[PDB]
Structure 1
């Protein structure tokens, strides 16, 4: 038995978060949103909220018509009092004019006085068109259950406004959660003189023009008793925006998980941080999933092809462990995903609720007075979600910070500088400062809204949810997270390209050091300069150990580590060379100057040629990202969007390439390549038995 509905709520949180997101995306893309009052999802709200020409249409279920008609008829019959039925349903004052021999005067008055919002000039004080559409959809859905006492024909009209993209202008502020803004939908429906709508290209329309462009099958509505209240009493503005916000938040949470893995790839982090034992032993499902997702990426990574201590390619980090933004990312992200998921279910309940008062219960033949207009689930879910968005942002800032710091990024250039001359390429330094600015503002936004409740409306509304205000702040937080995600993703793709450059230039240095050592370290009296064999292999070990980016811009400079360490190796072999060292013809020390002169003459041009080869699409060694599970995201950013590698040798600024990713992100184009990174995952961690 599940008498209080905790059971059904619990069941909605089984299965992975990723499978939930996949389902959300598939639902978003459906061509038709069919409303019946009970199956509206945040994905449908997000799809409809769009004004981007996807062609999505809304259809009302005919199965809901009978119940809607029953309560609208009931209210009309209820007005006939005394010698018929009883007193009067209930507006907010039994005495006045309501369609008897009167004429619906109270409903006209309701919408007039609720039109108390301020738009001013321009758009700064107007609710976004997307958000108004979300509100309209939710508003229809929460009147379809048949308990609201409104005509189906009004629902059909709002549906036409949605389908023809004719959008009433609503004020941004005025609600403590949504009478004031919702009264501007009602005022369009009733052709109030101040009502305005906007067409698909932004043209301002009169209510007359709006009805004609939308195809409304009728003239202005004259509201019946209960209809004005039915239209204005909902939580639809707050919950519609919350739905939009949570669609984005769910996707960005998956992006954060996958970026944490790509971060680990380019950082050469020890992949054992994702070992399932660790996460199993904490029990938290968000953390277990996050780790299993990162593990999936790392298990199919060509970078995790790692050479251990005294490294040649990628090392673990045994001495000087990986820092927390890498190694604790599953622990950090997990609870944020859990909050986003729980919040999503709260909002999905809200947008299928009857948020009206009083409810018209035809079965019991009475109106039921209550408090379902109290949007607490919106306020609470949006405050909690905003805190989680801030936490996701903080981790991204910390990861980004590690990535661009040459002391923490395991050999990558300071600032992810791309060009031949580091003194003319400061890479991501400006972006890094911008990332701090994004993170700081996100942490300010993390503060709650719902702890600022005023005792309102002659102290009748002595608690009130502040749901829309909170939704608006969470929306602002999500936009900043998209700025951060954009900046970080472009940074990660830069680092991928730098690792490709690194492996190629290291190969060329080894090749050249080899050639020179062979020529110079045998000469003798008669060839074989004893010794030379162990000396060559140790010189190459220097190359394998040293960070390319610590010297490759001036490889034969006396004060850079290549020349220094190569000389140190020659000196070490000379000191071990015994009596052969004391004969000039077999002396290693006496070949240092020659070795250095011959390396200086050859190495710069060899490095330059290899680099040019790589820049022309013909590197000696292919870019290992092509064999990684994360390739779809790199391919998308680099090839599909044309985001280019950033270098001080060219004029292009980081912002110019960030625009490409941000604009794509805001159009939903990152969804497919993101999910493609995980499409082979079976939804389970790797075994640990």
Structure 2
């Protein structure tokens, strides 16, 4: 009882609008909240002392007292991992030595194969999840450690944490704990990337290092904070890219001359996968009384019995293809949010019933498996995009458009978007390779204690990487689409001048109505791009057609006029045509190189790309290289700037 596009539209709004994240043990932190924190520095964290303070302090004292007495708890008085036989009564040194041994990652320096440290955005996200995790009053951590976390987030201090080492996130989390207790070997960023030792970093925000109490080290390092924080920003992005490609399907339909009936509600009602009904519903709305669908209907009414009666699968099958994709992206979002709003930690303190409970809430498998799913789904979005792209580039499938979307009339010096077409293959290829699962590679780890482990963080990173290739593919697809709209609008303007030339030239030469009828039919029916390079060349389809209609016309007539006179006028026709035709077509084209899109639901995307990002029809005469144009679009997608035209486009779809 919703519709995923309202939900995603909902995420986008929360992302730009939110100023304050409420962390209080009760109000849900959403995936858009995590992304906003990571990405927008004006958004601050608010730990609400009125909510959780007391239940956090009751849990704090309960573990204080107790481990201090006899009490045999896994966290406080026991050894760790496969070493849980080792009991001890030295609470503070047990805790600090655990942090010490986990400080075991490695930083890279000139890494060709990957970033050589975990990004600050994800480290900060992880800080938020750890804090939030504590608000359930289940950890036994002190309230001040929590305040400290809050203040580090708000001042933009974060530890530098190694990319690898988590099997899901002891090691990564030890770098937060290390910062907190001021371990000199841990380096920390303060805003400007500027770097200092942890104790100096605590200094600059008015903190002193902590001495860990019983259970505090464990509560700090036990958790899925890194995997989940990253899966959160991954999911946010997957929702908006998803909505992005769905939307771009409607733009593809317009430029390729599709038949919008593929999206008719009865097709989908009768095969009612929610993702299929909802993506179709959106596409139907997008294409309703589009001016390009009118150009399309025109196109298939001319020589109807000679053109494909159906579109190819990349268009007509888009909703059926999108359905599982939207469904896995959507419920993966629900499950990572559930993780985000959980006490992931061990043991779990039940102070009400006076006991510690030994479980495994640190196990990140919910996220790890769902990351494997979404990476497969994004690979599928990429295959959608690559197929559409492919269709657009090939004249036998693009229904009138030139091969490679190449414009400049001389095709021997204009190879159009052929370089992008090649990159799309490269992009998609790498993308499919990345969608193999990570969860199938579990090793029995930590003295065979962790015989089952999620690899959540490794999987999130690979899905993170799949998304980045998707952005490249969308950037290219979108720029090709804009290129296609210009060619569609020029196509139409060229067809008119050819009609006007043929007509006014039939008039001047005294040609009969019969002859004029056929010649004009040809002028309307033959696609210009098949002959734009040399309009008067007898081997190209225009004159091929015209000359055929002349013979057919002299044959129908010849009897009660004069056959000899007809040929003379026809020769004069051809000669005037060799004088005027190419000239008129050129001027119309030159004029176009500095109107139907103006009425389309995709105007926002065309306008954004053409004049907000300042680009133009691609040709041998525009100085910009394909890189320069796609770069701009890509930067807009990477930035979030692409959501402005996306929301303008979807404005008032509601329901």
Moved more, 178-187 or 296-305: 296-305
Match of residue 83 from structure 2: none
1:545 to 495, 519, 525: 525
Q: Retained in 2: the 8 A contact 1:307–1:315?
A: no
> Which SS does the other structure have where 1:649 is aligned?
coil
Q: Retained in 2: the 8 A contact 1:306–1:314?
A: no
1:516 to 505, 518, 530: 505
2:34 to 45, 49, 73: 45
Q: How big is each residue's C-alpha offset from its partner over 1:56-109, in whole Å with a ceiling of 9 and x where there is no partner?
A: 111111211111111111111112315xxx45563433633535xxxx111110
Q: Verify: 1:649 aligned to 2:621, yes or no.
A: yes
Q: How big is each residue's C-alpha offset from its partner over 1:285-326, in whole Å with a ceiling of 9 and x where there is no partner?
A: 101111111111110411111464774789899745210001
Match of residue 82 from structure 2: none
Match of residue 24 from structure 1: 11
Match of residue 448 from structure 1: 437
Change (3 A) 1:270 1:315: farther
Q: Retained in 1: the 8 A contact 2:182–2:202?
A: no
Moved more, 291-300 or 327-336: 291-300
Q: Verify: 1:401 aligned to 2:399, yes or no.
A: no
Q: Verify: 1:240 aligned to 2:212, yes or no.
A: no
Match of residue 274 from structure 2: 285
Q: Quote how far apart the aligned CAs of 1:418 are.
A: 2.5
Q: Quote how far apart the aligned CAs of 1:564 are.
A: 1.4
Q: Verify: 1:56 aligned to 2:43, yes or no.
A: yes
Q: Quote how far apart the aligned CAs of 1:650 are.
A: 2.6
**Alpha-carbon distance in 2 for matches of 1:314, 1:211:** 76
Q: Verify: 1:96 aligned to 2:88, yes or no.
A: yes
Q: Quote how far apart the aligned CAs of 1:130 are.
A: 1.0
1:612 to 590, 604, 614: 590
> Which SS does the other structure have where 2:129 is aligned?
helix
Q: Retained in 1: the 8 A contact 2:138–2:348?
A: yes
What does residue range 483-498 of structure 1 map to in structure 2 within 5 Å?
Answer: 483-498=472-487
Q: Retained in 2: the 8 A contact 1:643–1:657?
A: yes
Gaps of 5+ in 2: 80-85
Match of residue 539 from structure 2: 559
What does residue range 666-685 of structure 1 map to in structure 2 within 5 Å?
Answer: 666-683=638-655
Q: Verify: 1:157 aligned to 2:148, yes or no.
A: yes
Q: Verify: 1:333 aligned to 2:322, yes or no.
A: yes
Gaps of 5+ in 1: 1-13, 523-531, 617-622, 684-689
Quick check: which one's helix share is greater? 2
2:574 to 596, 608, 629: 596
**Alpha-carbon distance in 2 for matches of 1:68, 1:41:** 22
**Alpha-carbon distance in 2 for matches of 1:345, 1:147:** 23
> Which SS does the other structure have where 1:142 is aligned?
helix
Match of residue 108 from structure 1: 96
Q: Retained in 1: the 8 A contact 2:127–2:153?
A: yes
Q: How big is each residue's C-alpha offset from its partner over 1:94-143, in whole Å with a ceiling of 9 and x where there is no partner?
A: 633535xxxx1111101000001111325733111111111111111111
Q: Retained in 2: the 8 A contact 1:418–1:427?
A: yes
RMSD, matched Cα: 1.8
What does residue range 217-232 of structure 1 map to in structure 2 within 5 Å?
Answer: 218-232=207-221
Q: Retained in 2: the 8 A contact 1:126–1:170?
A: yes
Q: Retained in 2: the 8 A contact 1:304–1:314?
A: no
Q: Verify: 1:571 aligned to 2:551, yes or no.
A: yes
> Which SS does the other structure have where 2:349 is aligned?
strand
Match of residue 6 from structure 1: none
Size of the alignment, in residue pairs? 642
Match of residue 133 from structure 1: 124
**Alpha-carbon distance in 1 for matches of 2:435, 2:466:** 8
Change (3 A) 1:333 1:310: closer
Q: Retained in 2: the 8 A contact 1:46–1:244?
A: yes
Q: Verify: 1:145 aligned to 2:145, yes or no.
A: no
2:161 to 170, 181, 196: 170
What does residue range 199-598 of structure 1 map to in structure 2 within 5 Å?
Answer: 199-213=190-204, 215-216=205-206, 218-306=207-295, 308=297, 311=300, 319-522=308-511, 532-580=512-560, 583-585=563-565, 587=566, 589-598=567-576
Match of residue 174 from structure 2: 183
**Alpha-carbon distance in 1 for matches of 2:619, 2:645:** 26
**Alpha-carbon distance in 2 for matches of 1:486, 1:316:** 36
Change (3 A) 1:372 1:597: same
**Alpha-carbon distance in 2 for matches of 1:277, 1:219:** 66
Q: Retained in 2: the 8 A contact 1:268–1:316?
A: no
**Alpha-carbon distance in 1 for matches of 2:570, 2:307:** 36
Match of residue 118 from structure 1: 106
Change (3 A) 1:544 1:311: farther
Change (3 A) 1:314 1:559: closer
Q: TM-score if structure 1 supplies the norm length?
A: 0.90
Q: Retained in 1: the 8 A contact 2:56–2:136?
A: yes
Q: Retained in 1: the 8 A contact 2:258–2:296?
A: no
> Which SS does the other structure have where 1:457 is aligned?
coil
Q: TM-score if structure 2 supplies the norm length?
A: 0.95
Q: How big is each residue's C-alpha offset from its partner over 1:4-53, in whole Å with a ceiling of 9 and x where there is no partner?
A: xxxxxxxxxx4110111111112212111111234111001111111x54
**Alpha-carbon distance in 2 for matches of 1:278, 1:318:** 23
**Alpha-carbon distance in 1 for matches of 2:651, 2:470:** 25
Moved more, 278-287 or 629-638: 629-638
Match of residue 527 from structure 1: none
